Design a protein around this ligand. Structure first.
Ligand code: 76D
Length: 134
């Protein structure tokens, strides 16, 4: 067994708070914010050896990233930012930092009770998105 095994599974978004404001802070345009904010994605997380894959599937966009912990990769985000991403495990929490254009945002993914909690931070603005097992 692997430590990320707690994250492995198919997850569905059941609540989202302050995501529009998070997206504003990130720089997402009006029309993208409106459509992306309406999305209720399924998040699919799998682990194969050292490689973790996180898929996001919704009516807005289907995204997929695969990565090894601590090793930087290029990511194109759902809002079409080209970012440099590094994901690490810090005391059981997946910490995902995205860097682009001199800016930085951090997305934390945590297991809490039976839920998977995603905290998105851009400067002083935090959005909390909660997922349950699908
Ligand atoms: C528009 C940007 C900021 C964004 C969009 C999405 C969806 C709606 C495709 C997601 C997500 O995969 O939940 C995320 C997560 C990485 C929180 C970010």
């Amino acid at each position: 067994s692997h430590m990320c095994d707690a994250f492995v599974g198919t997850w569905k978004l059941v609540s989202s708070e302050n995501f529009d404001d998070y997206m504003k802070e990130v720089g997402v345009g009006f029309a993208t914010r409106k459509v992306a904010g309406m999305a209720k994605p399924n998040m699919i997380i799998s682990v194969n050896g050292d490689v973790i894959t996180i898929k996001s599937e919704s009516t807005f966009k289907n995204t997929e990233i695969s990565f090894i912990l601590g090793q930087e990769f290029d990511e194109v985000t759902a809002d079409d930012r080209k970012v440099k991403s590094t994901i690490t495990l810090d005391g059981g929490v997946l910490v995902h930092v995205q860097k682009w254009d001199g800016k930085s945002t951090t997305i934390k993914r945590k297991r809490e009770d039976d839920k998977l909690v995603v905290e998105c931070v851009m400067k002083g603005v935090t959005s909390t998105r909660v997922y349950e097992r699908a």
